[PDB]
Symmetry: C2
Subunit: 580 residues, 2 copies
């Protein structure tokens, strides 16, 4: 068990994880123009990137694809210096390119720690049983969720689990798919508040989610300690949060019975890609639970804002009603899974000692989100949209397998997906000034017979932006308006959809010899023209925000992460694949 825990850390797996990461650093740091890979007169596509001092040479072959994409080949990479080849080590790579990459003295050590954790997790993932794209689909919703291996396709340091010890990682990382029980707390009402959504009320919500039997048992616990149950609320907490933060950092709250530990949940939960959010494995119909988890990101503590909980359910109600009343959206089948209830806790002493940004204000909250399962009709299947870019050990993406099992010509397949996922983004932008953060982890696709029926969006309250400062919204919702410069409004599509998802989906489907790049992008223009066709009432906005402009700005995600703490790092422009 001492050794069992650390068994995934082996030389052979470490070496593979390091090669795979250096492959992604080369491919992604190039795209963001941190370094410009020189050609070498060898093949028509052999390149070299050198270290700060010029002595170490990383040599690789790469296929250059649309949107400045670099399909670097992992087996080709070589680290050479003074004539002799060296081991490919992600840690040495970032050191030797310390200055080239903009890694400052202050941040490089913590960045190497996030890098080591990401490599650890690849190593764990490399010990799981090998499963094919077909295999993941036969497994189902959570097979896909916990079978994702890449993570966010832009960030090189993307799957850190810093703050988990090795035993805590094995117990809580989504890639391990271990069941987890939440810890239930009673929070005293002088410091905790419960906000309900449309048609939710606390009394019955808690009954339908815990069981009359458990609520009684909990209410009994409180009476045993001389506390009136009517003075408290239930908060679910992540066990790591309880044992490591709440019981120590919030001991003043425990000791004064502002917080009372009621015990574990009887249901078993499974961590999603988000880490902090749990799917109810025992009863998939029940709500997801999003918890507060103070793990580390670049040495800064994460968490869940309690101040934001008061307005999350209302914002969701607003977006849900918005979607139900718009026929362009209803026709696409678009749905959100709403945050239906939330509860936030104010540690008043920490509050007086901090500003509205402290992670101490973010250490205890929770919200519940509708499960997507009960909507499913006969023969319909769920998948994280992230799977479309997931690749087999055999080289087959789940997108590729889906296209295959569907029997459709790839273009017809792509067009159903674009119509369910990409059309609503267009309509949100032009008709409501609405924008999202719609990447693979925030989107779920409903599947029938291998073809994408419709899309579900999750976690909208946190990310949603109405780009109209004067917009006329209900009161609890006006906090989502923002003043976005004109030349930047359209990067919600250009950056978040095209440059951060499609660029990989298109590049992966071409190297898979399934769909050529030019067809993919031609489909994306066709769907765009299909939408704008239908709405000449917006032709002025279609011109004012030209989805067919020849260039747009290059927005570099890894550069955002290396600067640390609209602050975007734009560096020149990209040739728009949609230009004709």
């Amino acid at each position: 068990s001492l050794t069992d825990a650390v068994a995934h850390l082996s030389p052979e797996r470490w070496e593979e994880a390091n090669r795979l990461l250096v492959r992604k650093a080369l491919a992604e740091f190039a795209h963001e123009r941190l370094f410009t890979p020189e050609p070498a007169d060898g093949q028509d596509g052999r390149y070299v990137v050198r270290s700060d001092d010029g002595l170490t040479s990383y040599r690789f072959t790469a296929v250059r694809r649309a949107l400045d994409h670099w399909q670097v080949d992992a087996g080709s990479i070589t680290r050479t210096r003074d004539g002799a080849e060296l081991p490919l080590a992600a840690l040495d790579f970032f050191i030797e390119l310390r200055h080239t990459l903009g890694l400052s003295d202050e941040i490089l050590p913590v960045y190497l720690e996030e890098i080591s954790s990401t490599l650890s997790g690849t190593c764990y993932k490399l010990t799981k049983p090998q499963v094919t794209a077909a295999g993941l689909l036969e497994g189902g919703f959570q097979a896909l969720e916990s079978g994702m291996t890449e993570g966010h396709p832009c960030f090189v340091a993307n799957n850190g689990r810093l703050g988990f010890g090795v035993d805590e990682y094995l117990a809580y990382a989504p890639e391990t798919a271990h069941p987890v029980r939440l810890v239930w707390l009673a929070a005293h009402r002088s410091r905790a508040a419960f906000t309900a959504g449309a048609g939710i009320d606390y009394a019955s919500f808690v009954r339908q989610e815990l069981g009359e039997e458990t609520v009684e048992r909990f209410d009994g616990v409180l009476r045993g300690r001389g506390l009136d149950p009517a003075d408290y609320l239930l908060i679910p907490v992540h066990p790591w949060q309880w044992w490591n933060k709440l019981s120590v950092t919030f001991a003043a709250e425990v000791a004064r019975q502002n917080l009372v530990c009621l015990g574990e949940s009887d249901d078993e939960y499974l961590a999603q890609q988000s880490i902090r959010t749990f799917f109810n494995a025992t009863h998939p119909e029940k709500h997801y639970v999003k918890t507060a988890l103070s793990v580390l990101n670049m040495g800064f503590m994460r968490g869940l804002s309690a101040a934001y909980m008061e307005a999350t359910p209302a914002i969701n109600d607003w977006l849900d009603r918005l979607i139900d009343n718009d026929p362009v959206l209803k026709s696409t089948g678009l749905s959100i899974i709403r945050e239906r209830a939330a509860v936030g806790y104010r540690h008043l002493e920490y509050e007086a000692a901090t500003d509205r940004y402290s992670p101490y204000r973010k250490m205890l909250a929770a919200l519940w989100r509708e499960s997507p399962v009960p909507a499913l009709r006969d023969g319909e299947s769920l998948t994280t949209m992230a799977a479309l870019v997931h690749v087999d050990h055999e080289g087959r993406s789940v997108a590729g397998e889906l296209i295959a099992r569907s029997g459709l010509a790839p273009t017809a397949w792509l067009r159903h997906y674009l119509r369910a996922y990409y059309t609503p983004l267009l309509h949100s932008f032009y008709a409501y000034d609405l924008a999202f953060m719609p990447h693979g982890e925030n989107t779920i696709l409903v599947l029938k017979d291998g073809v994408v029926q419709r899309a579900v969006y999750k976690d909208i309250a946190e990310e949603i932006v109405v780009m109209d400062p004067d917009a006329v919204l209900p009161p609890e919702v006006r906090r989502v308006r923002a003043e976005v410069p004109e030349d930047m409004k359209l990067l919600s599509i250009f950056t978040d959809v095209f440059d951060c998802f499609f660029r990989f989906l298109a590049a992966g489907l071409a190297t898979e010899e399934v769909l050529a790049e030019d067809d993919f992008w031609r489909t994306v223009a066709e769907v765009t023209r299909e939408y704008q066709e239908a709405h000449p009432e917006l032709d002025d906005r279609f011109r004012q925000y030209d989805l067919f402009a020849p260039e747009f700005a290059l927005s570099c995600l890894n550069r955002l992460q290396l600067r640390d703490n609209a602050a975007l790092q734009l560096v020149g422009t990209l040739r728009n694949p949609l230009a004709g």
Copy 2:
């Protein structure tokens, strides 16, 4: 480990008592360091008041004032009032109400509060423990006294933070819980780890003496099973908390490349001493203590153990040991140290590259073995940490007080014997060798026979020993100990570290106990000082140069440091009790 069991020490009652004791200390110690100057309220006897930053809230208390500007604040009397009504005595609200007065910046206050919560949690645990009397502790023995200490450092208010431990890990590892611990043993590659030996120490046999042949050959077997050669490896013992939370995640590159391989648990059971990182061997008290790298948090920063300083430590010890042997004044006093006999350090080369020498990533893996004080014990002799002299019963009897009773000597005679054992060597070190220690209660062990102190034992030499002569000739590894100390500050080594940071508490406690008047305490110290000085005219010049009998000396404030002879915080002066 039940969820509810683990937080059971956190009760409303214990929390209340815990807060009254800490505000008492904070009022007493911040008055000493003149962070506030208590005004006499109600013009009544010795009742004082200290008000919040705005004048609206009053902390009222009564205090006996004693030598060295000492405030014995009465915990039972403290009171917090606004608009006529009493308010709960809350340590956190205290530090927030006095934010501006104590200099708690907006940057440090949130984490200072967290440290206060930790110290309060620890007191709550101690309040949970069976009450033991001063006689009861001496009957328990060496380790009974170690884990029976409750105060911690007498000066620092926020003094027993255990930040980094989750509540389960606090119960497992904190010295005040006296729970047995097994060390984790690692094999480390000699490309990256150095074992450095003190005089007469050999690695192969040292390892054998400490672990046993059977286990060394089992560990060698683990290495062999992985295709490795034991000849390329050292053993390092690591704190379990360090292995599970730091080494197996942060040093993942090292475990995966098998520069570090995990061997198992120690068969011996260990007990954490007051420093938390250092373990007494409960199974075999005659064996070595182990001191470990343990990267917990003090004030937001990660503690640790420098590997760099490991190769010097056995040398510095040997040096001081021979010095003590080669000197007839010291030998007259029975003084010894428990040498650090071996050390081992690990250089993580990528982190080293990426950091300066102060980064905590260098102080994450290292260990040293320390001689046990037990086998040198003669018949009828016992051990106690000097911190126990200022430890006070739940009945008001200090251990110092009980020893004075048990001895049947006059309080002055008892003190004189302690002073010769402990204080006289410091004098000779300062004046004959210009050699200053850090001899606080936690770094000194006393040897007892018949309730009279026989001799002192110094530990933690290399970490704190300072030679006040930059030109002193010393063996090469020992030269790093030399420093330049201003002349006016050289003597604060005694005035500050001994007089104001220990004797102040001992003299005051003994006087309140009605065991020994302060004037008699200080007269005894003066007597002992001339007894030493008169028997050494060869050093008359220095005695006049560094006048121990000056009228006054600088007030050096320890708490003022924790909120910020290098940059100490000198604030005014103190009437030297030796002014006779």
